[PDB]
Each structure stands twice: as structure tokens, then as C-alpha cells.
Design a protein around this ligand. Structure first.
Ligand SMILES: [Mn+2]
Ligand SMILES: [Mn+2]
Ligand SMILES: [Mn+2]
Ligand SMILES: [Mn+2]
Ligand SMILES: [Mn+2]
Ligand SMILES: [Mn+2]
Lengths: 282, 282
């Protein structure tokens, strides 16, 4: 059973969310199995950012057990700006654990090195997710985002508990039940960083969302890269903390890491600067 | 100076927000001057619904001093649904006090009776407003919405404190600085009740946003409709509570109504049913 342990108040620099397995903190990056059901390709998706929020929360590569923490910018919290007609993130945003976009080699489909992070997932169900949630999802497709020149695949998925889950089985079903969502997805990822002064992003395949079969192949590739990484066999792990508490045959295995985590110290959400309210027309 | 007096928790039936003038409650409908600066065309806007929220809050016509409360439908709190790509209301939504869409006469521009409510205002500034807030705005234009067959003008305005206020003078400036907003506004008002099982709404003039001069004329007409109403001269005031504490020459003036209001009893927001998360693709 997966639960969360929150340190601090949301929207503060001290805020951390560890994922617990039977009450014990585990690595959100390495200890959560990629598959909830291997035979049926049902994946475990770690949610970082709830739909319509702005905080750039992420499984941290630099801290032990990789808790979800907010990224920083010039000493303060990092937030994505609202880009008309969108409000914050337009998907329950997260990643699949036990995956890695290898930054050491150039990926052929995109002709660029990976972004050094677990593969990303866009969960399109109706219910807004919570930070640290581990939900079970079906893969529907994938888009080849080049984010600031780096391979940055976006898997399109749906929570198996969603009322529409039974009807969503491949990429064509997203346009059938969520018309316009894919085009908006393409747009959002192209322009979301422009308010921060970054250039517009680009997609391979002219922004085409590849199907489930394709998605599964890429997911497997990123899972294989993580297998090499966690074994300590990457040519360069980029200082990522590979500490884990469920993989005994790995060099960085350490059960005590779980017991070192401070107890929950939940505090109510802290105020977010009103500047984040701003709607950008770009 | 205008402040707010909150009773109960947001998202509850007991929730009320009274507008105070120098600490004393006044009618949000009748006691707040329409004009902050008449000759410069600056108006006082009463905010009911902050941008990106769902609750259908409104200056209530049938309670003394007309506090803002949440509208209901079949005994349950009324919430507007999310219509892709929109999240809740896409503007700081409110009304102009001392105005009334006369339901007793068919309006010639729209060929329909008014909706019995003060004239509506869509404030397009960057900052998210707060319920019960009294802000000064400039009128830029107006759209003739026919909401469920009733005259329902929507004034397009900007908070004078907005960084872009000095550059926004007429309706054309909205397209320049807020490209796509007018089109999305037309769409929003046409489709927002479809998730509730209601027909698509319609606009007069093919949805054209009339200019500042046109907007001023309609605002003034609704102000005149309210002058007849407050004087007790309407053929049918529809049970509207006309009690006021600042208009001594009106029949319903009452210098005791203000002190009859209970003191603030602000509570934390109550939870909103998770079904309100749902994004409708209609
Ligand atoms: Mn990521
Ligand atoms: Mn990225
Ligand atoms: Mn990424
Ligand atoms: Mn109204
Ligand atoms: Mn209406
Ligand atoms: Mn109205």
C-alpha cells in the first residue's frame, strides 16, 4: 500500500513528499515497480504535479530516497506561468519510476541526448491527482518532445479507475473522447517556457502522438536505461542518488535509508506570490 | 474604504459575504455607487467570482443588504463545470451595483426581457480577485449574451490598477494585448451550461464585442432601470430586497439594517466535491 509522508507546508522551500510502502519511506525513483501488472501493461505512475497547479514539483535526483520537492529559481520556488488559454499544468503530471532518459547517448528518434530524468507521464483522467500519489495507469500513446534540445518523451496515459478507462485503449481514443486535448498538449509543451525567456520547444514527428505499441517500446527502452543506471553500470550517473531500500543486489542498496527519514510534519499550504496569477498571451 | 465581512465557510450554504463601508455593512446591490469617477468613466465593480473558480456566487437579491452567497439548484450548491480548454470562470466575474437588467420589458437590441440581475462585468486583469472585493474599473466594450433566452449583457472591463490599464482604452485594445480572449469569452458563455444539460447559449450581433461608447450606453440604461426600481416604481420588483442604508430619499431606506447584521465568523474553506474536477470536452 502506497501512502505519503509530508514534511513542511506546500509552497515552501522545506516542503518534501516521500512515498511510503507499508508506512516505510522508499525511493520514489527506484523502489516503486514500473509495472503494477506486467502482463496487462498497467504501470505505476508517480504523480508530481496536480492538474491546474503551477509549482514545478519533481522526484529529486539529488536527495536520498528521491522525495518530491519543488524546484528553485534564484533562491525562490519555481513555478510555471499561466499561458493562455491554459491554467498551470493541463494534465496530472508525473513520471514512471525505474526509468531514465539516458543523457549520455543520443536517442535516434529525436537525435538528442535524454534529459537525465525518469520518463514523463501525462495522466488525462477527470480527477485531479495529489502530489506523491502512486496511481495505476494504462498507456495510450507518446509524444516526442525536445525540451530545450533534450529528448523528453511524454507518455499519454489514463488512471484505470477513471470512468472512461474501459473505452480508452489506444491513442486514437484520446481525440475521440477528449477532442482538442492532444493539440493543446502539443501547444502547451511548445510554449510554456517562453514567459521564462526560453525559446519555443519542438517535437519530432511534427508533433504526432505515436500509438500504444510505440509508447511501450520507448518505455521499455527507458526502463532498460534505468536498469543499467541502478546497477552502477552507467558511464556517468550524473551524481544521481541511487540509494534504495528494495533492491538488495544493487551497489547502493541500504535499508537504513528508510529509517533515517524524519517523521511527517504536515503544515497547511503556504501562500503563493500573486505574480503567479498572471496570464501570458504568447 | 470598502472591506468584507465573511459569515461561515466558503463552499457551504451558510456562507455569506457582506460588503462593509468604514466597517459597517451596506447593500452590495444598492449602496455602492456605480461611479467611482463618472466623467472619467471609472466604475466600482463588485467581484463575486474569482478567476479559475467554479462556485456560482452572487449578490443575492432576496436577503437584506444583499450579501454574496452561493446560488443553489435543487437544494444543492451550484458550481459551474470545467469546459475544455477552460477552468471554471475565465475572468474575475462580478457586476456593477445600482444597475438592473429589467425583466419586465423586452430589450430591443436582444428582443428579450432582462435577467433580473445587476449588469455583469468581466474584469480581465492579471491579478485574481476576491469575493466581495470592490475594485475600480474601466469599461472597454460589451457583448450581448442571451442566457437561456434572457438579456444578459457582459461588460468587458479592466482594473485601473492593472499594469496594462493605461494601454487599454477601447475594445480593439483587448484583442491586441489579450489575443484570443474575446473569442474564448464568446465560446465560454455559449457552452458553459451544456454540461448541466442546458442548450448552447447565443449572442446578438453574431457575438460582436461592441465598443466602449456602446458599453457606456447600456450600463447607463441599466443604471436608469435601477433608479426606477430603488424608488419603488417598477411594475414588478420580483421580491428583490430593496433595503439600503445610504439612500435616505428612497422608501426602503433603513438605518437599522446594518447593525442587524451578525459579526464576522470566517471559517476555512469547506471541501468541494471531487466531481467538480471533471473537464468536459463539449
Ligand atoms: Mn519529469
Ligand atoms: Mn522537460
Ligand atoms: Mn523530462
Ligand atoms: Mn450576475
Ligand atoms: Mn446569466
Ligand atoms: Mn446576468
Amino acid at each position: 500500500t502506497y501512502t505519503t509522508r509530508q514534511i513542511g507546508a506546500k509552497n515552501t522551500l522545506e516542503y518534501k513528499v516521500y512515498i511510503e510502502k507499508d508506512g516505510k519511506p522508499v525511493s520514489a525513483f527506484h523502489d516503486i515497480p514500473l509495472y503494477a501488472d506486467k502482463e496487462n501493461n498497467i504501470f505505476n505512475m508517480v504523480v508530481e504535479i496536480p492538474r491546474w497547479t503551477n509549482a514545478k514539483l519533481e522526484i529529486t535526483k539529488e536527495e536520498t530516497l528521491n522525495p518530491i520537492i519543488q524546484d528553485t529559481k534564484k533562491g525562490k520556488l519555481k513555478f510555471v506561468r499561466n499561458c493562455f488559454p491554459h491554467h498551470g499544468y493541463i494534465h496530472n503530471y508525473g513520471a514512471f519510476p525505474q526509468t531514465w532518459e539516458d543523457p549520455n547517448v543520443s536517442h535516434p528518434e529525436t537525435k538528442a541526448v535524454g534529459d537525465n530524468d525518469p520518463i514523463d507521464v501525462l495522466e488525462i483522467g477527470e480527477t485531479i491527482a495529489y502530489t506523491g500519489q502512486v496511481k495505476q495507469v494504462k498507456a495510450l500513446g507518446i509524444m516526442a518532445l525536445l525540451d530545450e534540445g533534450e529528448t523528453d518523451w511524454k507518455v499519454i496515459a489514463i488512471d484505470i479507475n477513471d470512468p472512461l478507462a474501459p473505452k480508452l485503449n489506444d491513442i486514437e481514443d484520446v481525440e475521440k473522447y477528449f477532442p482538442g486535448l492532444l493539440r493543446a498538449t502539443n501547444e502547451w509543451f511548445r510554449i510554456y517556457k517562453i514567459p521564462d525567456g526560453k525559446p519555443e520547444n519542438q517535437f519530432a514527428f511534427s508533433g504526432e502522438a505515436k500509438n500504444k505499441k510505440y509508447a511501450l517500446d520507448i518505455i521499455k527502452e527507458t526502463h532498460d536505461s534505468w536498469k543499467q543506471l541502478i546497477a552502477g553500470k552507467s558511464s556517468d550517473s550524473k551524481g544521481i542518488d541511487l540509494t534504495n531500500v528494495t533492491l538488495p543486489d544493487t551497489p547502493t542498496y541500504s535499508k537504513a535509508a528508510s529509517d533515517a527519514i524524519p517523521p511527517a510534519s504536515l503544515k497547511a499550504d503556504a501562500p503563493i506570490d500573486k505574480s503567479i496569477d498572471k496570464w501570458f498571451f504568447i
